[PDB]
Design a protein around this ligand. Structure first.
Ligand code: BGC
Ligand code: BGC
Ligand code: CL
Ligand code: NA
Length: 382
């Protein structure tokens, strides 16, 4: 795929092969209050029952028809999180495997629908970020002990399995390595070099995707600058920062444009906005972790409430008003046009149990998500 010269238009399959509480709360809640991440979920259930419940979800959550709907929506890419444990749980891990059979199907189904797949190693041994979505929330132990070597071992098998397919256009080293949370950048760059070498052992045609580690994406200038070969992944969200979450719709749109002009256009590499969304609040149930509240309504970090989370926590955008859907679409269109100034975009996420603004499958049916660059209800922003 020509990342240097063509626009990525994608969606993530979040919550599928790496489960997250906010994406599928029912599954976590069926295992009780202490099931707060895939680690704890699988530990609580035990191996046999975890395999049963998680495999039921792997099978039901995604079909070929999902991929066809993605292609019908004007997409060309699907980013697919997978955890290291899919390639072999480590000694003592509670995790169960079996995801690879489903990722095999996704590659087939994506190909059939004309889509490329970006495989994303989303969770590393020890946790590269302390997020629930790494598998295990609550400390960063990646880079301790043998965790990096174990990450490369899993990455190698992942690359070996998939990079023979032209459907698999790109592979991401690790999702959201958390530099400000204590991931060492120099060591991260060494892991990035090793990942590049693994990719080139199997298929030098495949692009290597590197997260910016929460640093400004342009700070990565002069590292592995190689045209289409090496693509930066930056994640752009407006509900995890006090300044952004306080904004009205116009200010949100301006901040999207500023981000594109000051950061995306400042990078010496292709840059995908590999996660972004339609929501402007952090109201979705469990978004900040199961058992944590929301900035928006004052129930996180002693933030001062801006509004209530009564409408935006759960459900489907049909529950909202025409004006609320309209503003949501305005924010989405601005992001599409801003992010296509650089190399494109990959929405988070395809499907949820009802998280207003976060669920592309919902937003498409509701007429909120555009289906082409020409599908614009509002003037072009940025
Ligand atoms: O917080 C929203 C989303 O952010 C993403 O970066 C993480 O990579 C996802 O796994 C998470 O659901
Ligand atoms: O990229 C999105 C991520 O941003 C981080 O700053 C937050 O701590 C995470 O909760 C959030 O998922
Ligand atoms: Cl960043
Ligand atoms: Na909530």
């Amino acid at each position: 795929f020509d990342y240097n010269g063509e626009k990525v238009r994608g969606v993530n399959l979040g919550g599928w092969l790496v489960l997250e509480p906010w994406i599928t709360p029912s599954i976590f809640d069926a295992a009780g209050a202490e099931a707060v991440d895939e680690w704890s979920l699988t530990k609580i259930l035990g191996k046999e029952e975890a395999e049963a419940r998680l495999s039921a979800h792997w099978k039901s959550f995604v079909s070929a028809g999902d991929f066809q709907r993605m292609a019908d929506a004007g997409l060309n890419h699907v980013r697919i999180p997978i955890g290291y444990w899919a390639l072999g749980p480590l000694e003592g891990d509670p995790y169960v495997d079996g995801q690879l059979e489903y990722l095999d199907k996704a590659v087939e189904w994506a190909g059939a629908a004309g889509l490329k797949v970006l495989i994303d190693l989303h969770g590393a041994p020890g946790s590269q970020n302390g997020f629930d979505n790494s598998g295990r929330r609550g400390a960063i132990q990646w880079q301790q002990g043998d965790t990096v070597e174990q990450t490369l071992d899993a990455f190698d098998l992942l690359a070996e399995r998939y990079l023979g397919s032209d459907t698999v256009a790109a592979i991401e080293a690790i999702n959201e390595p958390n530099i400000p949370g204590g991931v060492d950048q120099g060591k991260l760059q060494e892991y990035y070099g090793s990942v590049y070498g693994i990719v080139n052992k199997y298929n030098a045609g495949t692009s290597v995707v590197y997260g910016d580690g929460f640093l400004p994406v342009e700070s990565w200038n002069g590292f592995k600058t190689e045209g289409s070969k090496v693509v930066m992944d930056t994640h752009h969200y407006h509900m995890f920062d006090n300044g952004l979450i306080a904004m009205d719709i116009d200010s949100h749109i301006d901040a999207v444009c500023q981000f594109a002009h000051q950061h995306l256009e400042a990078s010496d590499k292709p840059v995908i906005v590999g996660e972004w969304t339609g929501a402007v609040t952090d109201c979705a149930k469990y978004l900040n972790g199961k058992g944590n509240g929301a900035r928006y309504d004052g129930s996180y970090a002693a933030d001062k409430a801006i509004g209530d989370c009564s409408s935006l926590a759960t459900g489907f955008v049909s529950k909202l008003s025409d004006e609320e859907r309209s503003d949501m679409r305005r924010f989405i269109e601005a992001q599409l046009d801003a992010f296509e100034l650089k190399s494109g975009w990959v929405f988070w996420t395809w499907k949820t149990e009802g998280a207003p603004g976060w669920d592309m499958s919902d937003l498409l049916e509701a007429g909120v998500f555009p289906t082409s660059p020409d599908d614009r209800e509002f003037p072009k922003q940025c």
